[PDB]
Amino acid sequence: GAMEREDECFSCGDAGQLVSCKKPGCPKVYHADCLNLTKRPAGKWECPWHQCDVCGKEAASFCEMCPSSFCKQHREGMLFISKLDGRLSCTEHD
Ligand SMILES: [Zn+2]
Numbered sequence: 001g002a003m004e005r006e007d008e009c010f011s012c013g014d015a016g017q018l019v020s021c022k023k024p025g026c027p028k029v030y031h032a033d034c035l036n037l038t039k040r041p042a043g044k045w046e047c048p049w050h051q052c053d054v055c056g057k058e059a060a061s062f063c064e065m066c067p068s069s070f071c072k073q074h075r076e077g078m079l080f081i082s083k084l085d086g087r088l089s090c091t092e093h094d
């Protein structure tokens with residue numbers, strides 16, 4: 001993190017061997033295993049929660065229930081506000 005670092009994996013909902021994002025505005029942490037980080041990131045690492053789950057490009061919207069964020073193109077119709085808590089939820093959370 002660059003301000004704080006929560007002690008739970010946003011991907012799994014579990015805590016453990018966590019690697020934190022080194023980008024400002026990101027308090028989130030994840031497991032290297034669930035991220036498929038076979039290669040150990042060196043230096044500034046940006047979590048895939050900044051990457052569009054569809055095209056792999058930079059995400060503009062962030063699903064608040066999974067590391068599947070979306071770009072300006074792949075966010076339309078794919079991400080919506082959950083009426084349960086007001087959190088951004090993607091269509092893949094049935
Ligand atoms: Zn995990």
Ligand SMILES: [Zn+2]
Pocket residue numbers: 021022023026028046047048049050
């Ligand atoms: Zn991040």
Ligand SMILES: [Zn+2]
Pocket residue numbers: 052053054055056057070071072073074
């Ligand atoms: Zn995209």
Ligand SMILES: [Zn+2]
Pocket residue numbers: 063064065066067068089090091092093
């Ligand atoms: Zn989602």
